[PDB]
Paper text:
We characterize the binding of IAA to [name]-family regulators from both iac and iad loci. Most characterized [name]-family regulators function as repressors by binding to an operator sequence upstream of the genes they control. When a relevant ligand binds the [name] repressor, it releases from DNA, allowing gene expression. The structures of MarRs from representatives of each auxin degradation operon type establish that each has distinct IAA-binding pockets.
We recombinantly produced the two [name] proteins from the auxin degradation locus of [name] CL14, [name]_73 (IadR) and [name]_50 (IadR2), and employed isothermal titration calorimetry to determine their binding affinities for IAA, other auxins and related aromatic compounds. Eleven additional auxin and aromatic ligands were examined, with ten exhibiting lower affinities for [name]_73 than that of IAA. [name]_73 structures complexed with nine other auxins were also determined and refined to 1.35–1.6 Å resolution. The [name]_73 structures resolved in complexes with other auxins revealed that the positions of ligand-contacting regions remained unchanged upon the binding of auxins, with the exceptions of the His-32 imidazole ring, which shifted by up to 2.9 Å, and the Arg-46 guanidinium group, which shifted by up to 4.2 Å. In both cases, these shifts accommodated differences in the carboxylate-containing substituent groups of the auxins examined.
Author numbering:
A (entry chain A), B (entry chain A): 10 to 91, 97 to 149
The structure:
Amino acid sequence: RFVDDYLPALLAQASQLISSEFHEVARQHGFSVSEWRVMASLAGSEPISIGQLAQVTVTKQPTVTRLLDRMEARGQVERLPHITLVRITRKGLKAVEHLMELAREHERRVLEPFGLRRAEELKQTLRQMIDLHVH
Amino acid sequence: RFVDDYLPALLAQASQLISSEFHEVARQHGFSVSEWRVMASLAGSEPISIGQLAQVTVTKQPTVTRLLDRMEARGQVERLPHITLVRITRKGLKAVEHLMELAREHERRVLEPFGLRRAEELKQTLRQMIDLHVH
Ligand SMILES: O=C(O)COc1ccc(Cl)cc1Cl
Ligand SMILES: O=C(O)COc1ccc(Cl)cc1Cl
């Protein structure tokens, strides 16, 4: 059966199942999916361009720009001129840091049955595939 | 940097990049993303329930039901009573079979740099993760 062993279907299914688990936690802490992705990807980061943020959050750039409008109004991010750069503020970092700890715990739980070797292999393969296909 | 080594972000990014590549081909052959997922997941399948189809196509069930309304009007799928089951028709199979060959070729190209061992390891890990987290 094709779908059972077709890589893009496996990636899409695994991604949605794991993400859906953590999105429940994120919402219980006041975060939408997009807010979580933006703050977690900016935490501990130099300012990056709106285009880089859209890439790493897997979000269309027009959508990211409207999201940053409201996140900047809430004091959680700041846009700055170099192209437009964006950074997390201290308020945003304090808003997200506990949730990031919870995300690490959940990821640990997802990966523990597989063992350190298989978990690192998976992450390295995914990183290599991303770097080969990103524009 | 958190996002660089956080499994759900890696899965979401790799999934979107690989899928976006094949979706260009699919549209050039007349298929939307959802139409492609439905027909490719039903090809060579016993009839399955709408809920199973929603799961394997990573699509919300209300959306799948409206999609099947129009795909059934086009003669490409058929809904049948057991719960509602759904199957691909011969017309649908003939519509999608070439695109499935192209999808296999694209997947081969994505996986070839990694070698057979790493490619099979990735697919087995993804399958195991899906089976551990699906409801
Ligand atoms: O939403 C999810 O569960 C996975 O996607 C992400 C999660 C965290 C970050 Cl920082 C970036 C992305 Cl794309
Ligand atoms: O759309 C994509 O590129 C990947 O998602 C799929 C692809 C094919 C099938 Cl059959 C099922 C799914 Cl979820």
